[PDB]
Design a protein around this ligand. Structure first.
Ligand SMILES: *[C@@H]1O[C@H](CO)[C@@H](O)[C@H](O)[C@H]1NC(C)=O
Ligand SMILES: *[C@@H]1O[C@H](CO)[C@@H](O)[C@H](O)[C@H]1NC(C)=O
Ligand SMILES: [Cl-]
Lengths: 232, 203
């Protein structure tokens, strides 16, 4: 037993209050109001159409809610009353739920934790209590090696950016290290630059490099290792 | 006289290091044990995965947990996997751990932060529908707030982890109970607790 996530939207809940207070007096017997609304509130507090994780993003919530409110207004503007009204309404809610189920399923397959490696932090809304918090999407410790060969005397670009970094929350700085054969390291840059440029490369610039994208949290969000070869 | 046999050791379970030693790097919540750990980097990383390969037990069985709740469970794992100060509570089932006394704050805050999250049973040690390779709620078991199935902090500490932990009435810095997590800055408050219990002076 879980709610239809759409009540997490304030405009939706207010539209439902407005339906009860503004629309029902003029369009339905007073006797029927309380039962009607208990009936509506049941339709909304249970969502049977859905592996559902109980979460949604703001976009998905908005899409559903917009759809719902748009159709709901269609009904109220039509000025329909009695049986007609009751049955149209619940029939609408049913179909809306099926539509929303789709938005959810799409969200789970395409927008929930899209990173393919590392750790992405993303804000979700928990449907069971409308609470909105940041979730960690952990896919893998590493983001893998990059093998790079550079013509001598040309510029070396090491790219630490991934598809999803723009979207992730809680990211700080891209730190770049040189990794020496003697088991030590040196920090060479640290900033909002997702790349490292070393210009006009010489043989001495070959070897191991590492990127770490920092997080507001205690550990890095992306780690990428580069192995650099210089063509003499 | 002092139980030094029982100090600075790791249990024999499948993931654990045979002996404790420092690590350069541990993931997030297991960082406090850097100095001297029974977990590898890989173990520490695996502790934070959804359906951790460490146990193939799903926490999301009633849907995704609130992050604050998840954090507690992960810390529990970090502690179990990484602590070199559990000797006194090690026992065979090839070993496990029984009635490690968690300080009252640890159990209370854990309970507090999981109230809003949802589960379907009060005894996680077994009785699950296991059909997918991973546990799911058995037929007829309702998903409800944690405070329903774990009315007290004690219930939570003790039953989720099959009596690996005991809810101590003792509070932090008593010298008589362990923290499942602690700030690296502050130094490890559990070392002296282990020593005390190893000794003939406490059981
Ligand atoms: C270790 O390695 C690098 C390159 O092999 C060398 O330049 C450096 O002097 C060494 N660093 C230290 C701190 O010993
Ligand atoms: C958990 O499940 C996996 C995947 O099916 C299985 O191969 C593995 O043996 C299990 N892991 C452990 C540590 O028992
Ligand atoms: Cl410890």
């Amino acid at each position: 037993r879980s709610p239809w996530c759409v009540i997490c939207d304030p405009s939706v809940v207010l539209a439902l209050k407005s339906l009860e207070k503004d629309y029902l007096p003029g369009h339905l017997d007073a006797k029927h109001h309380k039962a009607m609304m208990e009936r509506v509130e049941n339709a909304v507090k249970d969502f049977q159409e859905l592996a559902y994780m109980g979460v949604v993003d703001e976009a998905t919530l908005q899409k559903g809610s917009w759809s719902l409110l748009k159709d709901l207004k269609r009904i109220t503007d039509s000025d329909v009353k009695g049986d007609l009204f009751v049955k149209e309404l619940f029939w609408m809610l049913h179909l809306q739920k099926e539509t929303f189920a789709t938005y959810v399923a799409r969200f789970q397959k395409e927008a929930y934790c899209p990173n393919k490696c590392g750790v992405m932090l993303q804000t979700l809304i928990w449907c069971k209590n409308c609470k909105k918090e940041v979730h960690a999407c952990r896919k893998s410790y590493d983001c893998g090696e990059r093998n790079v060969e550079v013509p001598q005397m040309e510029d070396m670009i090491l790219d630490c950016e991934l598809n999803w970094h723009q979207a992730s929350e809680g990211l700080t700085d891209y730190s770049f290290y040189r990794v020496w054969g003697n088991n030590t390291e040196t920090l060479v840059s640290k900033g909002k630059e997702a790349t490292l440029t070393k210009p006009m490369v010489g043989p001495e610039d070959a070897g191991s490099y590492r990127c770490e994208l920092g997080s507001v949290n205690s550990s890095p969000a992306t780690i990428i290792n580069f192995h650099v070869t210089v063509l003499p | 006289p002092w139980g030094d046999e029982l100090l600075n050791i790791c249990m024999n379970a499948k993931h654990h290091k045979r002996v404790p030693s420092p690590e350069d790097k541990l993931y997030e919540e297991c960082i406090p044990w850097k100095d001297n750990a029974c977990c590898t980097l890989t173990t520490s990383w695996e502790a934070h995965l959804d359906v951790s390969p460490l146990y193939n037990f799903s926490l999301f069985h009633c849907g995704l947990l609130m992050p604050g709740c998840r954090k507690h469970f992960i810390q529990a794992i970090c502690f179990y996997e990484c602590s070199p100060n559990l000797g006194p509570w090690i026992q065979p089932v090839g070993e496990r751990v029984v009635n490690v006394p968690l300080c009252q704050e640890d159990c209370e805050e854990w309970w507090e932060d999981c109230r809003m999250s949802y589960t379907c049973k009060s005894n996680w040690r077994g009785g699950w529908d296991w059909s997918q390779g991973k546990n799911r709620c058995p037929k007829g078991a309702q998903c409800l707030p944690f405070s329903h199935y774990f009315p007290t902090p004690a219930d939570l500490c003790e039953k989720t982890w099959s009596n690996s932990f005991k809810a101590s009435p003792e509070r932090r810095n008593s010298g008589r109970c362990l923290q499942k997590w602690f700030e690296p800055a502050q130094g490890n408050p559990n070392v002296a607790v282990a020593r005390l219990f190893a000794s003939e002076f406490l059981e």
